Amino acid sequence: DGVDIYFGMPGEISEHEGFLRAKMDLEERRMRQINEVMREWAMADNQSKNLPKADRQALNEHFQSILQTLEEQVSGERQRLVETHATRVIALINDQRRAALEGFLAALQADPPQAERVLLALRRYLRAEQKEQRHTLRHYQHVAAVDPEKAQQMRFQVHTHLQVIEERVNQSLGLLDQNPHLAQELRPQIQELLHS
Amino acid sequence: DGVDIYFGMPGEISEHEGFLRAKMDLEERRMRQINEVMREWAMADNQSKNLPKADRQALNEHFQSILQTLEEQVSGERQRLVETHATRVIALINDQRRAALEGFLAALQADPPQAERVLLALRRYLRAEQKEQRHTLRHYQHVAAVDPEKAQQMRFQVHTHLQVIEERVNQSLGLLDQNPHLAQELRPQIQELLH
Secondary structure (H helix, E strand, C coil): CHHHHHHCCCCCCCHHHHHHHHHHHHHHHHHHHHHHHHHHHHHHHHHHCCCCHHHHHHHHHHHHHHHHHHHHHHHHHHHHHHHHHHHHHHHHHHHHHHHHHHHHHHHHCCCCCCHHHHHHHHHHHHHHHHHHHHHHHHHHHHHHHHCHHHHHHHHHHHHHHHHHHHHHHHHHHCCHHHCHHHHHHHHHHHHHHHHC | CHHHHHHCCCCCCCHHHHHHHHHHHHHHHHHHHHHHHHHHHHHHHHCCCCCCHHHHHHHHHHHHHHHHHHHHHHHHHHHHHHHHHHHHHHHHHHHHHHHHHHHHHHHHHCCCCCHHHHHHHHHHHHHHHHHHHHHHHHHHHHHHHHCHHHHHHHHHHHHHHHHHHHHHHHHHHHHHHCCHHHHHHCHHHHHHHHC
16 A cells, blocks of 8 residues: 555656546546435435434435535545646646756857757757746636636736746846857747747 | 538537637637737836836736736636536437437337347436436536535535436336336346446
């Protein structure tokens, strides 16, 4: 048990599919649990017809109470599943940006800087930043789609976050300006990258 | 254009994937819109560095107002998509159940009722009822996972509906009763089935 948890999911399974599969497993599990309670409650109603009012009310309370507990478990469970997935999603996006940055840095500090290697490492970096931009836009778009009130609250935060991403791209590109010749050479192509 | 709307979505495309495709399109469309506003807002901030405290506030209230509207549009749009999708899902489940019911009935009324055909039809019908049961369960399950206060108001309805389904299934199996010999030879299969 604790050992299976340690090994976690096999690398063959992506975070996304592993998340969906876990999500589906819980959906099916909760559906079963709910149906069992609903049936018990149905059987109880059939039997209870000829019992005192105070007893029928107590019986109703008993099942309503079991469902409420079940509702809270389904909700708490979904929330944990959601936070775990969102945490892993952002973590990987940060890791990819950082790894791409180290690569861009390496290509710029090569004994004799190769325009090709530098251009490719920069492309990778700029694509990592783009992914975070899209992640940021998509999250906000999502909240506005299902919860307008919360969307208005994060508005300024999104605007700022997007500027933070843009300044990083400018700061990272400034690393290329420390080499006028190289910069002038790749300018037209980089412009194409930043434009797309 | 009205023509394209008339033909609607290709039959080969299921309602589920069509829904997801439309939702994804809107997701990307709105993401681009929001980004454009965000860019304009950032640019205004830059060119508003040397302005009077009052003009900066106005400028902010401006883009925030543009976004409030955009949010409202994104919200109403999603609601429309969700509603359209949900109504179609329930209708298709009702239709398929009625179809399977007729299919089951027909196999039972065949000149020489053929066991095998009846079994498959009965299986299809039960599967159809189960799809509605699973749709009821899942809906309640979904509303609980993302809106607890509302799930509580659903309890009785769900309870009542699942009982309605179970009773229907029992009433339908009773159509077999009107065929003792048939119900006899088919007695075992229908039993292993019920589970």
